[PDB]
């Protein structure tokens, strides 16, 4: 442990040894019954600082027009239903003045808040897993073959998993127990997640920051994170109960900045 340094470089060294609502814009969701709000990796979504921001152009922050609650589509929960995934910000690419700022700006940095809501009765049973996965590079269905950009994510459409495996020639491997990444689906509880147990929970609220290796990135060729809703316990009821149990996703961008103003994309 003499700890002397012969060379001049650092890389030449040795090893180192109820009523709780959210009012975003002109929009209000309601409620959490004083339950819980999962926030990211413990980090609230903030703006860009000056140690960051390699760009020299001045940022565009609308703060009201783009940062309100955008209600996505509604999907149908069945007994033989495997799961769904939405890839962001592709799912918000056409909604309001948020998707309009994306076309005129080269870079873009934003955080989100995801509110997955699915109500039932006391006589329904089931359990969902709502998980937000950053950088989910998915595997193709037919290996050694490239696959299409409209099979990964359409514009705001909920791409769904499958109970069996997928033999498609141009899409991703949608086996739900491999979760599209070749990984065990029980181990997706590292990412910011929350369960929806139909006997006690009724909702899930995740607040994700901007997680990327660069401070600002183009949002038309890079999926920042995907949102996977996978039921682990399947929906079961009596045949006299209400059979249509829908799942609505409501998502809202938080602290959105843009840079590089030019004409409309995205060629």
């Amino acid at each position: 442990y003499t700890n002397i340094n012969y060379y001049k470089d650092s890389a030449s060294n040795s090893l180192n040894r109820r009523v709780r609502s959210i009012t975003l814009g002109n929009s209000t969701i309601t409620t959490q019954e004083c339950a819980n709000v999962v926030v990211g990796y413990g980090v609230w979504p903030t703006y860009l600082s000056d140690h960051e921001a390699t760009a020299v152009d001045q940022p565009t922050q609308p703060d009201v027009a783009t940062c309100r609650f955008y209600t996505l589509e509604s999907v149908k929960w069945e007994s033989s239903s495997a799961g769904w995934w939405w890839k962001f910000p592709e799912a918000l690419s056409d909604m309001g003045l948020f998707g309009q700022n994306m076309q005129y700006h080269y870079l873009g940095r934003t955080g989100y808040t995801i509110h997955v809501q699915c109500n039932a009765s006391k006589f329904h049973q089931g359990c969902l897993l709502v998980v937000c996965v950053p950088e989910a590079e998915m595997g193709a269905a037919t290996t050694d073959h490239a696959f299409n950009h409209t099979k990964l994510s359409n514009i705001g459409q909920a791409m769904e998993f499958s109970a069996k495996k997928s033999t498609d020639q141009t899409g991703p491997q949608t086996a739900v127990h491999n979760a599209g990444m070749g990984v065990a689906v029980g181990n997706l509880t590292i990412f910011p997640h929350q369960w929806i147990n139909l006997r006690t929970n009724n909702s899930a609220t995740i607040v994700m920051p901007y997680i990327n290796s660069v401070p600002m990135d183009n949002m038309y060729r890079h999926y920042n994170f995907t949102l996977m809703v996978i039921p682990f316990a399947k929906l079961e009821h009596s045949p006299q109960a209400s059979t249509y149990v829908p799942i609505t996703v409501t998502v809202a961008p938080m602290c959105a900045e843009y840079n590089g103003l030019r004409l409309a994309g995205h060629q």
Binding site: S12, Y41, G42, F123, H177, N187, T189, N197, T200, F232
Partner: protein, 238 residues
């Protein structure tokens, strides 16, 4: 010059030594690091978060989502067993491919208390109790609710709480236990029995589902780093 002398062990390449080297590209201006969220500084911080255990791994349920779907139902006589497995993380094929199990397999020793968490995903109107019991190795394995009540146990009602935590205490003669489990360092048996029943009002389905998560407590530690016996390859990937 200065008179030196070469000790044995020179001009050798040990793959786990700690020496300096001449840099190939000097005076490099590296890019400044940014505040990327969620930085991890230890491998046990990954192993201290939950991961649902595939307890119902009877074939061929491992190729579907039914591997995580421990079934319960209204009984005829009480005291029956629900599930049961050995407490061999890293070697027993129930909790081997979980998140705790894939981390011990990079190691050859483990020690500390494990934490099992349950989650009853049934109806909101059903009620029942269970007897989740850990048994020290000794001799032998319990085959009744009367036998698996003398060891460490808790009692978990599903009408009061939906989640129960069972801290499995560390009882051993040694300070560490081997991951590739042999006969000398045994660890014991986890079982779960019906305490009363599952009682439900009419117009509710019978068969319910219990999830089970495994984690690590604060006194968990691992030693003797090795390579995992899971991946295999012969030729280089192209």
């Amino acid at each position: 010059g200065l008179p030196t002398m070469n000790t044995p062990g020179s001009t050798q390449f040990l793959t786990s030594d700690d020496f300096q080297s001449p840099s190939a590209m000097p005076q490099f201006d590296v890019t400044p690091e940014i505040q990327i969220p969620g930085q991890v500084r230890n491998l046990m911080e990954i192993a201290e978060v939950d991961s649902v255990v595939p307890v119902n791994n009877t074939e061929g349920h491992v190729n579907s989502m039914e591997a995580y779907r421990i079934p319960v139902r209204p009984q005829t006589s009480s005291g029956e067993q629900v599930f049961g497995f050995q407490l061999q993380p890293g070697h027993d094929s129930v909790l081997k491919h979980t998140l705790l199990g894939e981390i011990l397999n990079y190691y050859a020793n483990w020690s500390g208390s494990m934490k099992l968490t349950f989650m009853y995903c049934g109806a909101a109107m059903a009620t029942g109790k269970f007897l989740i019991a850990y048994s020290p190795p000794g001799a032998g394995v319990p085959g009744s609710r009367r036998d698996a009540m003398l060891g460490t146990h808790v009692i978990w009602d599903v009408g009061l709480q939906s989640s129960c935590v069972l801290c499995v205490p560390w009882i051993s003669q040694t300070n560490y236990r081997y991951v590739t489990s042999d006969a000398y360092t045994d660890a014991g048996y986890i079982t779960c029995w019906y305490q009363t029943s599952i009682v439900t009002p009419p117009d509710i389905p019978t068969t319910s589902t219990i999830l089970c998560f495994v984690s690590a407590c604060n006194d968990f530690s691992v030693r003797l780093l090795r390579d995992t016996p899971f991946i295999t390859q012969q030729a280089l990937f192209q």
